[PDB]
Amino acid sequence: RVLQVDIVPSQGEISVGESKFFLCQVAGDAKDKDISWFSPNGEKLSPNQQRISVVWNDDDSSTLTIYNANIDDAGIYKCVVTAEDGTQSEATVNVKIFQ
Structure with a gap:
């Protein structure tokens, strides 16, 4: 219809103790649009909870x-x-972490 979403990079491998941000870009103009983030455990994550800060x-x-x-x-x-x-609409990103 109009809504567009894409996270970059597609697959971001990381190591413990390292930081990692994923850019969620969009495209369209279907009325007012909002953004959300869902952690791999099947549940939205807050911006002021832990090391994972959203913006x-x-x-x-x-x-x-x-x-x-x-x-x-x-x-x-x-x-x-x-x-x-x-x-x-929606998007996803395969984020890895090795200890």
Whole structure:
């Protein structure tokens, strides 16, 4: 329809103690748009909870920063956007972590 989303890089391998941010870019113009991030455990993550700090910069672009990385964080993160009526798009990123 209009909503577009893409996380970069597609697959980001990392090591414990290293940081890693994933750029969630978007494209479209289907009414007001929102952004969300879902941790590999099947649940949204907060921006002020742990080493994983989220941020919203551009009109609808948001980066998923993960400072002190851990094997627990290593997983398929998600980036879901939502429309004014309800039409929500999405994206993903295979983030790895080796101890």
